[PDB]
From a paper:
Examination of the overlap of the co‐crystal structures for compounds 1–3 in CYP125 show that the incorporation of a five membered ring onto the phenyl ring offers a vector for further elaboration. This led to the development of compound 4, where the pyridyl ring is fused onto the 5‐position of an indole ring. The indole ring has an ethoxycarbonyl group in the 2‐position and, along with the NH of the indole, provide vectors for further elaboration. The affinity (KD) of compound 4 was shown to be 3.0 μM (CYP125) and 0.75 μM (CYP142), an improvement in affinity in comparison to the original fragment hits. Gratifyingly, the CYP125 binding mode is preserved when these fragments are merged and modified to develop compound 4. Although compound 4 is similarly effective in bridging the hydrophobic active site regions in both CYP125 and CYP142, the observed pose is notably different. In CYP125, compound 4 extends perpendicular above the heme and the indole occupies a small pocket formed by Val267, Glu271, Trp414, and Leu415 which is not utilized by cholestenone (PDB code: 2X5 W). In both CYP125 and CYP142 the indole nitrogen in compound 4 forms solvent‐mediated polar interactions. In CYP125 this involves a water molecule coordinated between the carboxyl oxygen of Met200, and the sidechain of Glu271, and for CYP142, the interaction occurs with an acetate ion derived from the crystallisation solution. Combining information from the binding position of compound 4 in both CYP125 and CYP142 suggested that elaboration of the compound from the indole nitrogen offered opportunities to exploit the space above Trp414 and Leu415 (CYP125), or the pocket surrounded by Ile65, Asp77, and Leu72 (CYP142) to further improve affinity.
Breakdown is then initiated with the conversion of the C‐3 hydroxyl group to a ketone (cholest‐4‐en‐3‐one, cholestenone) by the oxidase ChoD, and further oxidation at the C‐26 “tail” region via a three‐step process involving oxidation to the hydroxyl, aldehyde, and carboxylic acid species. These sidechain‐modifying reactions are catalysed by the cytochromes P450 CYP125A1 and CYP142A1 (CYP125 and CYP142 hereafter). Comparison of the effect of complementing a CYP125 knockout in the CDC1551 strain of Mtb (which does not express the CYP142 protein), with CYP125 or CYP142 reveals that the two enzymes are functionally redundant with respect to growth on cholesterol. Here we present a series of compounds based on an ethyl 5‐(pyridin‐4‐yl)‐1H‐indole‐2‐carboxylate pharmacophore which bind strongly to both Mtb cholesterol oxidases CYP125 and CYP142.
Author numbering:
A (entry chain B): 19 to 247, 250 to 427
B (entry chain C): 19 to 427
C (entry chain A): 17 to 427
The structure:
Amino acid sequence: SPNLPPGFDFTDPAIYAERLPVAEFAELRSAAPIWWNGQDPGKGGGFHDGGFWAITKLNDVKEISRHSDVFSSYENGVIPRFKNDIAREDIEVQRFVMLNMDAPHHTRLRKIISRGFTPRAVGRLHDELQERAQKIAAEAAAAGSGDFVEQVSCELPLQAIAGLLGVPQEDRGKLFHWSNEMTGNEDPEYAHIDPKASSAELIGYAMKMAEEKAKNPADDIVTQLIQADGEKLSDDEFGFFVVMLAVAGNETTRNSITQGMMAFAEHPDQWELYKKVRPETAADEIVRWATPVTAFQRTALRDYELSGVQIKKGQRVVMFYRSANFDEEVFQDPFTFNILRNPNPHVGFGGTGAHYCIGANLARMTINLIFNAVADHMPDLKPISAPERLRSGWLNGIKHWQVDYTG
Amino acid sequence: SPNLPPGFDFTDPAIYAERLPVAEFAELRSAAPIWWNGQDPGKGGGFHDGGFWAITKLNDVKEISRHSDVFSSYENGVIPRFKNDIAREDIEVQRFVMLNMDAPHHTRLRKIISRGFTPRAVGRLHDELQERAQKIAAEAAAAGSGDFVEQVSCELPLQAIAGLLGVPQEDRGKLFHWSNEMTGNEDPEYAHIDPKASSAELIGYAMKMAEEKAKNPADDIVTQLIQADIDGEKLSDDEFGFFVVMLAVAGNETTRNSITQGMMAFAEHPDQWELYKKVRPETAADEIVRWATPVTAFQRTALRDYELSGVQIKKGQRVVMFYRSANFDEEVFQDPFTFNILRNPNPHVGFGGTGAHYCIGANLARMTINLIFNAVADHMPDLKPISAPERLRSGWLNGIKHWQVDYTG
Amino acid sequence: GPSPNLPPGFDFTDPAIYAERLPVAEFAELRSAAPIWWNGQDPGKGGGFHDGGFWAITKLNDVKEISRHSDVFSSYENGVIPRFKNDIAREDIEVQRFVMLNMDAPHHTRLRKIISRGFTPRAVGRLHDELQERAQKIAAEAAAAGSGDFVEQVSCELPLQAIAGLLGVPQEDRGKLFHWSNEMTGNEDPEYAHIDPKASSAELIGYAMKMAEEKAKNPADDIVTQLIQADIDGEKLSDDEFGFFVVMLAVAGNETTRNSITQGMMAFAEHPDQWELYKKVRPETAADEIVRWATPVTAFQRTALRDYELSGVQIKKGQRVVMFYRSANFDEEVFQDPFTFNILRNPNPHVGFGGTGAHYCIGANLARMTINLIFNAVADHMPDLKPISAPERLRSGWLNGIKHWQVDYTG
Ligand code: HEM
Ligand code: HEM
Ligand code: HEM
Ligand SMILES: CCOC(=O)c1cc2cc(-c3ccncc3)ccc2[nH]1
Ligand SMILES: CCOC(=O)c1cc2cc(-c3ccncc3)ccc2[nH]1
Ligand SMILES: [Cl-]
Ligand SMILES: [Cl-]
Ligand SMILES: [Cl-]
Ligand SMILES: [Cl-]
């Protein structure tokens, strides 16, 4: 039995509102790398099965991710924590997006959606995103100091979304608002916000966009998505595409930027090296270090033995990427922030398999462009005060972080 | 060979600004109960000796505290962490107060000053602190919501200091100001306040008090301390100043943080809060202090070679007593991670290890705790927190700067 | 005068030449008929440089004049290596500006001053006894094998142990230090087609920055403490600067000294009277005649920062000049009988370590001591060695390398 407090729950949002439980994950890797995480009645964050298998080793994460035929995303979704009193109906709605589907449905959507994440679609946004990154960093440097999350981390990921969807500048303000309103709904700072209403607004805007583009086809992703190659996103599916993209492409990359800069602030030797060399390998080490998604879950569709543990049909497994990305048997000096690290087989974008992050290259470009812009415009920036973390059971978020850009 | 990241330092203020390193402390207790905590050059929080011995077990904490003739408070003081660039002299000025003295100097001062903190002397403040506690809780309940630290935790410990000293009401504002000016000095929120200057202010005021009481003796505490006793012993004028400084500092943040973290414990354990409201048990104060452990760690310096639980402590080496670890020692408490306000016996070391330096204010602190929680139970029994607390950056103090709570619930 | 008698399109940096031979007669033809000569290069055939060609510098006095006028002849503008793979990306040339070799003043001046703390005569002399011990063991191990690859069993190890000893690299880490060092060069030869110098450099820098951090806490007697402790003016190598220093060393003092050893013994095998004299007298002047004969760095380049007239030839701003040390070290106007291998040659003003000036090899005396120590050990343990077959040369446009050389140590 691992040396943990009685009743300890790795999906407890109260933990992540304070800290990442690095030491507790290290104890699991050392003493029980696949450990049953029991959950008292009504304290399962919306699931009522008594607990889940905590997965803490990178190889087990990869095994679960590659065996999607067995470990299902559709069955219970991939988010392993909601409000304890959430309604099952409000969990199953997740199934309307590609992330929480199984083959064959998922296979079909994935193939169509790939049209929007080709090296062309991504690479074409480089010049505008580079321009926007440089302006953002310039604006922050002129301000002298402020909330790094709002002034440096937030905009560029959202502009990458808008650019990819070809959203007109006039509607980006409201688009960004709706996207943000579906973030951090479990944290008291946002407890007054109705995310269901914002999702309905996004779906609506997405439909006008798809209908408008059907009548006026152009050389851009949305038209490629509603156009038939005879496979094409249905009007509805395109709305759920936008919702999923407005959500998946926002907080995760944002939080990679905040926590990457926190890493640089704590390891100035790495910041001095970065500013000189600008290594393209930095983005992956920032994603490994930041692990913006702490965990996604799966559900066993049949009995499966994983590293000597008998997982039973119907049981949940929770893949703790935050643990796996510091696996002492995979990484040399996992607790060293090393922007030259290469190869870097982290699972911050998930394990290799059917659901691997389709936006990983877009995320890497966003990260490299903003940090290049930070190095260009505020090379001497230093933190003012401690970051404020997000209350979430599965997202690793930084809400606010005060920084002095002039140093 | 504990399972810790390379370079981990248990006195690193950056840790405590975020969290209490509970799991890391537990790993030491399990795999290396006495462990050399190496510190790089220039990262010893004012000390330049390569590191210190981490003490994580309760019996070890007590053995060190009982053997004060070996483990000195004077050689390097008891605070284990300052700003890295602190001058040595600024560390050595600590020795002017009882806490950082060794026998025989300490023995005499403790004998004289203890007269002001007896059960009787403490009991004298009960009524005025009870009335104040009730008013504090009423005024907070009426505000509906706010920062629990400021509205409930901060004032009553300061009024206990002023009451013990007999400070006129008109002077309490500036007394509280200088007392707080010597707090939160390693945290960016209060990085712009000078401790040494304020200590001079406190000392100057104490001189005016001693000078006045020599002219108009009264039946209070300042007069007793400046009056020769039956054995011809008394605090000198300088000694009285450092007593006020010691009191103004020692009676403030620690009790404040026991109240804040006691209420946090109650909020995370609603069954215990219901029991407290119904029963108001006399064991709750000690369990609150065990859970809060407001002083995370105090240090000693070995005056000679000493073998401690099979480890060889060499002369000149520092040992750091981590009360935060000892108070959750699984061998002493069967269920340390249970918050049990009926815990009895409760051999916690929140007030230190028994010995020559055991907190003389423990009875005063327990009364302050009991009075304010009785008042909270009376006036806002349904309070619940709004947002997460904001912790204090410090290498040895366990502090909560702010905590928003809905008193009405 | 007439044009030099060279094949049309001949390129003195062509790696395909050096994989087979040293172009000795071609260099001699330039010295006689066109001592400063425009080496044209066809589109896409410039080894990473796309400017139409360069000036071939073949006379020792011209090499010295360029090396001394570093204010005009820049190392930083295009780096000093004159040949990479034809398709190398410009960004992969410019990243090499982070080592001291490819820096101009004032950045070069500061770094060299700091680095000098690690190459004092005292620091290098402190390595004499350990390197002597290891040389004798190397030669004894080789002789006990009876026959084998002289490059691998005699030439390779001592230069790497010199680097390791200078830096104070623990014994358990020397294996990977040596691996990283060997992965830095040769990538144009089919034998090394799979090496990744970018990756090697990154792993070395990461290792080196960790060592810098560790050795700040516990200072040792190596040069690392000297390099990373600030002086009065606060001058010291940063951790990443120490990393680029280690990269520079792992490169600059590995294959160069190795190839001096291999070609020194190649020369002794062709000149047995010199070998008999060496065994008898053990003259340390041999090390400099060996470096002159071996010229392990065939050529380094510079770039003109302004128009400059050099021995009657108008060099134009922006043009590259390539200093062919291999030609200058056989310059008939400086050396008496340059094509005689003479281990007593004295004075021996060769430019195998470069021309005097700002970038002159800081490791020259460590190199000479390594050479004298290994050849004493070879003389002591295999005085009768004899080659079995012909050396295999390295495909490089600027390094004069021997990959393999089979020899019978017992004779
Ligand atoms: C650092 C930034 C990001 C991180 C850490 C991240 C993380 C992840 C993870 C862990 C998964 C699921 C892995 C699995 O279950 O196998 C995933 C999938 C996904 N990601 Fe990301 N992501 C990032 C950026 C983005 C961006 C920028 C986009 C869109 C612009 C995006 C869109 C998606 C989508 C649509 C999926 C579902 C794929 C599927 O179900 O087939 N992500 N991402
Ligand atoms: C919850 C509240 C408090 C806590 C957690 C606490 C904690 C401690 C601890 C752990 C020590 C041990 C010193 C050592 O062994 O090195 C100590 C000593 C001391 N405390 Fe407290 N204390 C509290 C309240 C107070 C109050 C209210 C006062 C005075 C009004 C006070 C005055 C002192 C003094 C003077 C000493 C030094 C005694 C000596 O050196 O003989 N403390 N305290
Ligand atoms: C026979 C062996 C060697 C040869 C033929 C050689 C050759 C050279 C040459 C030609 C230069 C450039 C000089 C110039 O541009 O003026 C140089 C520079 C350099 N060498 Fe050596 N070298 C040898 C051994 C070593 C060793 C053993 C070390 C150190 C362990 C070393 C370290 C360096 C460094 C750091 C530079 C750069 C100096 C600067 O740019 O200021 N070399 N070497
Ligand atoms: C109920 C649905 O709404 C959410 O609760 C929510 C889903 C979600 C997904 C990501 C994500 C997924 C894959 N790749 C990157 C990011 C991020 C935040 C999310 N929130
Ligand atoms: C840490 C950043 O990475 C580098 O320091 C780096 C080294 C390096 C070497 C070459 C190279 C050298 C010789 N021959 C061909 C290529 C190219 C790029 C490089 N980058
Ligand atoms: Cl000092
Ligand atoms: Cl108990
Ligand atoms: Cl340039
Ligand atoms: Cl000569």
